[PDB]
Curated annotation (Swiss-Prot):
Organism: Homo sapiens
Lineage: superkingdom: Eukaryota
Lineage: Eukaryota, Metazoa, Chordata, Craniata, Vertebrata
Stated consequence of mutating residue 265 to R: No effect on catalytic activity. Abolishes HKU1-CoV viral entry
Gene Ontology CC: one annotated term: plasma membrane
Family: Belongs to the peptidase S1 family.
Protein name: Transmembrane protease serine 2
Outcome (variant: residue 176 to A/S): No effect on catalytic activity or HKU1-CoV viral entry
Posttranslational mods: Proteolytically processed; by an autocatalytic mechanism. Autocleavage induces active conformation.
Amino acid sequence: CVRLYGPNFILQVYSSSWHPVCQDDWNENYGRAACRDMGYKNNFYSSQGIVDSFMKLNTSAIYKKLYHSDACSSKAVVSLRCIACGVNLNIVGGESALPGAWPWQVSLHVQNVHVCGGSIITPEWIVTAAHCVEKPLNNPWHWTAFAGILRQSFMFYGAGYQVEKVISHPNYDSKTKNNDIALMKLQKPLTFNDLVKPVCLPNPGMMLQPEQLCWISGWGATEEKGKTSEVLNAAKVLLIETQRCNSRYVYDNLITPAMICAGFLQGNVDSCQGDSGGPLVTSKNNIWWLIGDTSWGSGCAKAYRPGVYGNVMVFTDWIYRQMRAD
Ligand SMILES: *[C@@H]1O[C@H](CO)[C@@H](O[C@@H]2O[C@H](CO)[C@@H](O)[C@H](O)[C@H]2NC(C)=O)[C@H](O)[C@H]1NC(C)=O
Ligand SMILES: *C(=O)c1ccc(NC(=N)N)cc1
């Protein structure tokens, strides 16, 4: 019953609404304990008092040691970051990605060939699409991950990161593609550097614009019915309002609250076969956030047939629980 709220990572605790935690008597050790509860295990980044009813710490005997208070004597609330994420440098109709521009991007291989995309969230956890791991690719032995390499010809056999665990959302529906999200855990943790870094998981209360400016990246075909791209490509896309995406001329009521549309109704710029499982990201408060995972669409870059992505914000607490359960 502990969460991070908005682009400023305000620590909140639930009461049978949600209230922010006082900076009073708080320290890095309480922050570490809060991150462990969220399933971040050994990950911790920062804990600081932001000037934004409250939950106050009881200096007697992490969640059970908080009580409701009218005011914070420190006149600040806790801002909690569990991992250094969402920092980078500085597909149809896109452009070659630069080194370090999309450092959370991974290429997921089966039998030495790219199958799907993925997004690094921790040194051992990757977010992908549940449709990527449908039978007969449900078992983790099939899979290997490539990070910090832009080119498929530079992804050598024996050099990938073996996948040890595969977890599909319990409500994934293969007919409709509803709840199209899965997690992969690596056998060995990744080494973060200027080319390999995680993207931030989205917090409730991001307050994105109806047509928020986003980016997609992947090794998917550069034209409908085309082959896997040898190079990583990236493109700017705008969110498409669900009411508009659900209209008779677009996807006629097939867009659920677990899905987000992005792209252009005139087409020309879109995700395609092989981009699936990959990131849909946005920049807000100088942080890159994982808004979606490439899920589905009718054809590629066709007019009135945009891209459909898993609504990652809806899945964040399910993700936390799987990371904690491991
Ligand atoms: C801070 O913690 C103490 C100790 O857990 C709380 O005191 C207990 O309150 C319950 C009733 O809710 C009593 O049954 C216990 O006997 C109390 N314990 C002790 C050691 O006296 C205290 O209420 C908490 N402070 C606040 C402001 O909530
Ligand atoms: C997955 O590989 C995938 C996702 C989306 C599309 N189509 C569109 N974005 N229109 C194809 C394939």
